[PDB]
Write a protein that binds this ligand. Structure first.
Ligand SMILES: Nc1ncnc2c1ncn2[C@@H]1O[C@H](COP(=O)(O)OP(=O)(O)O)[C@@H](O)[C@H]1O
Ligand SMILES: Nc1ncnc2c1ncn2[C@@H]1O[C@H](COP(=O)(O)OP(=O)(O)O)[C@@H](O)[C@H]1O
Ligand SMILES: Nc1ncnc2c1ncn2[C@@H]1O[C@H](COP(=O)(O)OP(=O)(O)O)[C@@H](O)[C@H]1O
Ligand SMILES: Nc1ncnc2c1ncn2[C@@H]1O[C@H](COP(=O)(O)OP(=O)(O)O)[C@@H](O)[C@H]1O
Ligand SMILES: Nc1ncnc2c1ncn2[C@@H]1O[C@H](COP(=O)(O)OP(=O)(O)O)[C@@H](O)[C@H]1O
Ligand code: BEF
Ligand code: BEF
Ligand code: BEF
Ligand SMILES: [Mg+2]
Ligand SMILES: [Mg+2]
Ligand SMILES: [Mg+2]
Lengths: 311, 311, 311, 312, 308, 302
């Protein structure tokens, strides 16, 4: 049997995710509003049962699922494609039945599924038995004869929504496209991902950054901020020569031959008594020259096709 | 001989389904007429043994099965593809035999199977042992040597009727296509799904709605009515400011600066003593602009192919 | 000691089967002629041991098996694929051995197997242990070292005879194709399936019906006759108005305003004392417009392939 | 004390009833008759054959030849399918094999027949190599025992699928023989055998005309066209209206409407025995030839020429 | 089912391409040397890809990272991951990252990740979607602790690697063909304790002769060289005394003291093996062609020139 | 499941293969003959793979090595390990190495090493074997593993790598086939000359020892075959003795073997020509594309 139970909460708050307030609105009214205000949702007025998120890779879908998982205050299940597909013949499907069953047992609950494109695609006869049996149980077990469709919430994610079948497209009754973040949201993600590190710039300088970075993803922002945090490490471990500055001794990397320039390596230098140089904009522009964006623009044209129709 | 079964207690009545009068006629004469009038069915006049329902997703198939399940007054079995396919080798087929066996034990009765496409498809050799053994037992056990084909009524549903094998197609001896609905039925579903909520419109305004919504499904109607029932709380949480109107205190969202406009949030306001905004066409039309028709039209061309031939 | 025996008593006459005079000849000489005339079969002259029937679905195969079962006057066994395939490892095969064993114990006897395609197909290694063990025991136990092949009789049915393996094809030594019925046989099935219901037509009108219905199955005939028997219930409970005609009170549906036309519903009318208008030609033609032929014509080309070779 | 179910009674078929098979007839006469009649020849270097396989397309006469050996044995003829070897729990699946060859050596001289050896063997994955690899392994040892027990037993293998037979058991059956479809003269012989004691109408060259008409059948095809030929005069008895006396007191046969002594009646009207059936005529034979096209397929013959062309 | 080892390989054991060396010394040794620098915004690298032509020592360098790591160093090829059944192909991935998190702090190596990528099109459908999907979501996802474990990827085909897994391996390093001096160093290492015959500039002549090999190519020409004088001894007729009591070596037919015999004829020890010298080396260089191809190097310069 | 023996097969009992033989002599016998040669970091081979087409008696050659190294021969079939024993196979591979350690000098023979790898469960056998072949180090001295494969190209590269030395076992050449015919008839009464044996040799290009063994087993029975079927008996020469002869000959009576008295039959003498018959009715076992497939392996992993 083994009951396939998996549920754990990380820490990602609301405003960690920047921008796209339609999805924030729909998920606050789909998650917080049923739990905090159950009396409003009564009779004809019912909460949303199936919500699909989609878009290009790294626009913040699974991180938003993390934010819902932290801000849930509910039995947050989560399952990959691993725990559903079993060995023999029968546990591949009865575990789905027990998943939504015990999900309804621990109601109010939220279910997230990542990359539902691995379970769809009934057109043709490829991926035959797994697609028909497992996908059929996802349909009928999602709603069907005597399933309590109230209670639980099914969060779907994908990168390919056009290969998603129209029936499961109707199952995910409120679908939301997640675009590449605009100027202001990327300004916000810059001001978030700098964090507690002492920066040097102002808000309109972050606006200059977001103007320079037209058309990235969230991971692209995470790695240009990472590289911006990782240039002074290369300055400290780099080359030969440090120097004292200023609570008892403190040395930082400096060029060969300078005011107090001893010749050494980071290894030579004592615990703590290292001075790493500030973060800097030059670090930002160096990170811009480091990495090209990952997303392709014809795939964005297909996202504008399915979004322009069904979004 | 360990038997694992199930049964239901649903709640759906006749007038909730709009249109579909042929299916309503065939199921009233296939369900109500045998039980209420058993004396009419004698000798040459025999009840229907196999009924197929099919069509695009969300035209009301499984909800009609709910209506038959409530209006049955009979032992209503229902089985998905899960409970038939077993682990080892033998219980995958003997459970089918015990299903129709105990179904004949509790006669008169109705059996529903959802998404029978997971049990068909003998063409080729894919899904070999499960398809031949389980599907063979569905054929022979459905009717065969000494099966009492009288009594139990088998209601079939699917979304893919062309992959259904011709033998089971003959088993479901009276098949009915369920098209996309029309103007008047969607007017009826609007006037049903508004329910007890105090609306604002008239009947010809619902006709204007159904004229605006050419080519939806029933789920599309359910979610535009759902979104229409969410715009009140969207207005309550909107901005800063509520106001008393009118059984002891009752406040609703209003614009900044109005007759009795206090400044607050929904959180500030007491249990129940919240007032909800009246349904207006603007919420309806906003919900129409929110969501495209879900299903495609080339799939409708294939439904017109199989319907135009075999319907 | 397993003892998974089952047999029964149906009721189907010879002459309720239409067409198929070759199958009628082969089964009269295979069933009636051994029992009534055992002295003719002695020494070199031996009865037939294996007879196969095949064809498109609903050409009357299993109903002919019902007719043999009624007209047997012999211990008629019948087994599906369910009772042969067991759980563990050994009872899947020893039950076959006990089946032909106790079949020879109750000689003279007839064995029918429906849809033998679930036990064949040794080509490749799919369905490996069940196919090799169970099918091997079907071969050797059917005839082999010391099996008394005289006595019993193995009746095979299928819908797919080309996937039947050539060895079992040789086992079923006298195979018969069962086509779609022609004009006269469908005229006969019309005149049988009208039964005791008072009709309105003549024999050449049934010839007009069979001319209108070119290329049906037996189930198609059964459901157009069924729909023809379900039109007078629709008319007797349709709209408003019945009328007395003629053993104490008897009312039938009639148009609004007629000779003795009271206004009521079927519900208003007393047990029995309600009679529906006799089947009419229009009901027949309406049933012809109701339902397509079931079978497809490329499958008929494969039936002409296997029939043209092995028939 | 976990013994089995064996053969005791032999099914009487004569040695002359088969046709063709001259290599198999030679190998089994030298493998059965020659050890018993001449034990002094097999000594030292000269040893009898230990493993003999028969194979071929279905219905070329393999199991019927095993019937002929079973009648002509005069020895304790065991026979076992795949049923009696595979047991329930874990251990009797293999100890019964050990007791089979054990009690087979107890009742020596003796012959062992195994039909459909591909059901014994056959591995694809983990499920196929469980509880069949054990029994296969015990067969592997107990037929490695040629150096242990050369004299005594003989293992006759039959199959229809010899390519799925594993190469190790292929080496165990050390002298394998392909059994093809029969030719003109052998089918003439099977016609003249299967007519039996029934009074025929034809001559030997008419049977040659039959075998020329029936190019490429099996033995079962011959058995059913002869069977249908033995059903045609009773079909004449059932058919039409009208019989007629001919010739030990009254004897009537079917004849056309209006003939020399043509009374009008049905078979039902006619007294026990005093019926006369029509003698088999070439027309019933040729009608039976038109009734059933050959059963086996020629691509299967190409695979028999593959395995025969290699390992035959 | 799952392998583990703390191997021998050191940074000085590795010869060549010191930018990848200092990069892995940073991303692996810097969590070891200064874990207290990595806090809050400053986080260690999670996914590092190595790639290029075959035989360049990526697994060997991973073993150098393993020895200087002091951590549970896993390593897996594709052979422990290919679908034989329909679902130990995926649950073993789940147990791999699961037990990898059980033995944290840890390092995971995967060799030739090109056998798990390539979602474009529908070829290799169920294995690619299921197994690759679990690699993505299980690599980072809803509630995966992405901290801790380190995923080392290797391949020979990086362009067929999908862009999503390309982003997963967030710090990728191209490994080019090495140079003269590093192959001189690998010659002087792989000769080992065997008594050679040459000097350092003769190894420079060797590396000049061997322009454009891999590390495995060096390993097999040194291996064949450790068959070469033994191949002289196993060959031919005639030995000869030279010089602690009797000592004979192979010599040509007809020479100063050339007796005719075989090695078998000659007494324990009292054999004088031919010296190990270059003609055998240069003959081994003429024996074997470089395996790798240069248009594949042009594609490595394409993907490296763009994304490197 | 594990066979053990102190075999008695000399080099001369193994037809041909002189090249392998000479490789094995210096690979295995030299270390054993003069152990003082292998002090310090100089260590004798401890894995040898024997590869080549089936029917060359790789096993028999292996026993000769054991006989000549004066060692116990321990042996196991990998097919049996993978299928028959399964569950207990880890235990078996253990015990096997354990016996061999306890019994130095000794040799482990693993037949069909390819059959260790693929078509989870036998992944254990692979894994245990590898751990054990690392046993040269815990106990490097005194044991040697000889693997045998017909399909070296299907042999797990990890296992492959544990077999330092690889030796090709070719199909027999003229001289070897000639020896095989002689050995296979041994003492049997026949009238074959030295030249006939050579002829039989020359006439079986591409045959294996196995193939030759079956042909010879077939041929020797021919005189028994003639006597059993024999027709027309003529007297020759201890009181009456008749043999088959053609229709119409010096003393040619017409009869069948059945007609002739116990013993007083003279069976036909063995002939070189008769084997020629047997050669026609037994095709060689081994496909001709195997040469290349095996030589591809000699080129790549030799
Ligand atoms: N709006 C956002 N605010 C903060 N972090 C973000 C945002 N969007 C993306 N990220 C970063 O992206 C990563 C998660 O991406 P994910 O949603 O898993 O990609 P995908 O959408 O392809 O699943 C996290 O490291 C997170 O920090
Ligand atoms: N005609 C209809 N009348 C009332 N509700 C409907 C109708 N069509 C659809 N619905 C609603 O939409 C959903 C879809 O109906 P259902 O029979 O379950 O279709 P499906 O199984 O194809 O999704 C149901 O949950 C039901 O509440
Ligand atoms: N020739 C026929 N005569 C009478 N009824 C028939 C005939 N063919 C079919 N039927 C009717 O149609 C149905 C289908 O025939 P049946 O033998 O059950 O088909 P199948 O062999 O495919 O199961 C049966 O209910 C039978 O009564
Ligand atoms: N040579 C033959 N002579 C006479 N009858 C034969 C011959 N070969 C086959 N038959 C008949 O054909 C049938 C098949 O013979 P058999 O060996 O049992 O074949 P199988 O087991 O493949 O069905 C039997 O009824 C047998 O009487
Ligand atoms: N840069 C290097 N320094 C030292 N040895 C190397 C180097 N590159 C390759 N080698 C040698 O090559 C052998 C095999 O290299 P391998 O790790 O298989 O290459 P790959 O990068 O394809 O995995 C190793 O045993 C190693 O000793
Ligand atoms: F989803 Be429905 F049953 F087409
Ligand atoms: F149902 Be039938 F036998 F095609
Ligand atoms: F013996 Be047969 F080929 F069934
Ligand atoms: Mg449904
Ligand atoms: Mg049927
Ligand atoms: Mg047989």
């Amino acid at each position: 049997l083994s009951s396939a139970i998996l549920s754990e909460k990380p820490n990602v708050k609301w405003e960690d995710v920047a921008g796209l307030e339609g999805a924030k609105e729909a998920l606050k009214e789909a998650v917080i509003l049923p739990v905090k205000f159950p009396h409003l949702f009564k009779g004809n007025r019912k909460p949303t049962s199936g919500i699909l998120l989609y878009g290009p890779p790294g626009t913040g879908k699974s991180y938003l699922a993390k934010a819902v998982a932290t801000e849930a205050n509910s039995t947050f299940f989560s399952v990959s494609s691993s725990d559903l597909v079993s060995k023999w013949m029968g546990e591949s499907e009865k575990l789905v039945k027990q998943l939504f069953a015990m999900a309804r047992e621990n109601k109010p609950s939220i279910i997230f599924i990542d990359e539902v494109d691995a379970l769809t695609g009934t057109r043709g006869e490829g991926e035959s038995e797994a697609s028909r049996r497992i996908k059929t149980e996802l349909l009928v077990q999602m709603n069907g004869v005597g399933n309590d469709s109230q209670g639980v919430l099914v969060l779907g994610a994908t990168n390919i929504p056009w290969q998603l079948d129209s029936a499961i497209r109707r199952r995910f009754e409120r679908r939301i496209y997640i675009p590449l973040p605009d100027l202001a949201a990327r300004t916000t993600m810059f001001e978030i991902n700098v964090g507690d590190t002492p920066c040097v710039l102002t808000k309109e300088d972050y606006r200059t950054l977001g103007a320079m970075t037209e058309g990235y993803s969230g991971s692209d922002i995470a790695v240009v901020v990472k590289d911006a945090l990782m240039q002074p490490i290369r300055k400290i471990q780099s080359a030969t020569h440090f120097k004292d500055v200023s609570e008892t001794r403190k040395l930082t990397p400096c060029s060969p031959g300078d005011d107090g320039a001893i010749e050494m390596s980071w290894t030579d230098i004592e615990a703590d008594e290292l001075k790493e140089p500030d973060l800097t904009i030059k670090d930002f522009l160096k990170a811009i020259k480091s990495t090209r964006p990952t997303v392709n623009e014809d795939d964005l044209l297909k996202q504008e096709q399915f979004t322009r129709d069904f979004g």
